[PDB]
Amino acid sequence: HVFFAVITLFPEMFDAITAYGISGRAAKRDIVQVTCINPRDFAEGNYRRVDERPFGGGPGMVMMAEPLAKAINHAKQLASRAGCVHVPVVYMSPQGKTLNEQAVQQFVDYDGLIVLCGRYEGVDERLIQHYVDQEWSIGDYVLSGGELPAMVLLDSIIRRLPNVDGLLDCPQYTKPDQFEGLDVPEIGHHANIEKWRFLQRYQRTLERRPELIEQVTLTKQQKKWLSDE
Amino acid sequence: VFFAVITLFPEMFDAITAYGISGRAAKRDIVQVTCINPRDFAERRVDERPFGGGPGMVMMAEPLAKAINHAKQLASRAGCVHVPVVYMSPQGKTLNEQAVQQFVDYDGLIVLCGRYEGVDERLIQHYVDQEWSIGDYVLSGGELPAMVLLDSIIRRLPNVDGLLDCPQYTKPDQFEGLDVPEILKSGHHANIEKWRFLQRYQRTLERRPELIEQVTLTKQQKKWLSDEQ
Known part of the structure; x- marks a missing residue:
């Protein structure tokens, strides 16, 4: 029962993987489990703010460390309660190591993952330093958030799980003649x-x-x- | 700006049309995304065994051709001048920030999402203008790469240097x-x-x-x- 916790402002986005296709089938069969944690649930204020202006100026907002720290701690306790031995915290960012098939194979041996999905224009570096075990990039392009890379990583792992050469594939043909x-x-x-x-x-x-x-x-x-x- | 995706799982695309900055653009009609299921154009199987033998199923050309042509008529009716048909597959050129900027010069896209273990080579030869890979990892389908492509483009649209970003900080001190x-x-x-x-x-x-x-x-x-x- 591989355990997945995603830290995201848009939990519903992950219906794209939990409700359809081969990954959806694994979730319905409880071969895997995906739990989304909204950092807003660990935010202070009537608007549950998780973003604040950057030190040093510049445009955009930075994700605050404190809500993310509380959410990741909640995720870790869920993972321990699920019977996981250890679950690394993965941060999806263009500054991570390049994900590839060799990297995906290493994840299959895991009990589960906590995947942190950033939004806005950065995540406080001190949160990354203290709470992130691994940082992975799915490609050298810029996206509005970490949710889609998280789904890419999760889909790539779930696809290889039990009960679920370096050359390019050759052209394929089917009916009609x-x-x-x-x-x-x-x-x-x-x-x-x-x-x-x-x-x-x-x-x-x-x-x-x-x-x-x-x-x-x-x-x-x-x-x-x-x-x- | 016109976006058409050929997918067996249209509902997956709620992750971009219903959440985040891309969702806000869709709600404001800055962009439009239309999903086309090839199953509606079968006379209703869309996969068949390979001609040369071997394992797996190949997506048939005829349902995809009717769907891609239906997509083309939708785009022309919307007034788009040039809409390339993009196919998302691991055998394509690697998407990057330079490639994403090049898409801005278009009127819109038809993105083809493969499933199963391949698409008939003759459909690709006749209907696909560009083939792009988001990374050297294997996913269960082309939908997630399509959303990755759509998100990175929509993010850069109006009214919406080669170095890695530097660290960012916000409160508390x-x-x-x-x-x-x-x-x-x-x-x-x-x-x-x-x-x-x-x-x-x-x-x-x-x-x-x-x-x-x-x-x-x-x-x-x-x-x-x-x-x-």
Whole structure:
């Protein structure tokens, strides 16, 4: 029962992953659990403010440390009460390490995560220093908030959970036999098809991501296929 | 600005149309997002086994072609001059901030969200103008990348340098023993802008040193660096 707690101002956004698709199915089956924590519940004031003007000037608002600290502490206690051994706090920001497939595989071994979704134009650095264990970026583009990266991370993990090579995929075809004048390649036999599929993958990787060829490990059979062509 | 997404899960797109800054833009009709389910254009399966054999299912071209064409007629009826059809897949060029700025020059987008284990190559050949990947990780579907693309564009629309951002601070003055840097607390225009720039440069150097090679510094910033180095 992998445990997920997200610190977000918009908990309902996570219906996009908890109510649909393969991730929704895992939540409905309780293979995973997603609990959203609104930092406003830990804010002071009739407007439950979590943002304040930046020290040193400049535009925008910064997320206050105190509401985020109380919310993450609440998340940690929920995780302990759920029977988790340890749950790291992940902060999604463009300043994090680059998420990739190798990084996602490491998360599968976890009991769960606390994912902190920032809003406004920053999060108080002292909160990051004291409460964040890991910082991850899904890409070098700027988004309005951390919710979508959080969902990307969660979807990428849940997708790999039980009960739920470095080359690019090759082109794929399905019915009809002819579409708008374009036919399926005639290539059939099982052996000769797998050879064709591999040669298509290598070239596609070669044409589009040639830096990945340096880091691919080919079987003895695949090495022979390359030399034969 | 016109946005059309081809998705089996239209409801997922509530995360951008109903919350946050993008939701505010949608409520104010600064943008419009229309979801098109390919299931409505089947005569109602949308997936079938691959021609060459092997595991998985491929999204059929004919339902997607009717849906993409239906999307095209909706965009023309809205008066858009040029609307590229973008396909979100891990085999695409990597989205970044430079690419997102390039989208602003468009009248609108048709974004194609794949599911299952592929899309028929002939549909891509005939209907897709651009193919973009948000990262080198595997997700259960194209919806989350589509929302990532939509959010980063909508955020930059009117009426809505290569270094990492520098740290940010707000009240209280001291949090869990950590103080706000005095330069932010009591500094002026010049000495703060110098501090923020040196923080950005160092943070980029420590965390993303490959980005230093592609930054072009003003004479003012070059002087700030040499005064420290």
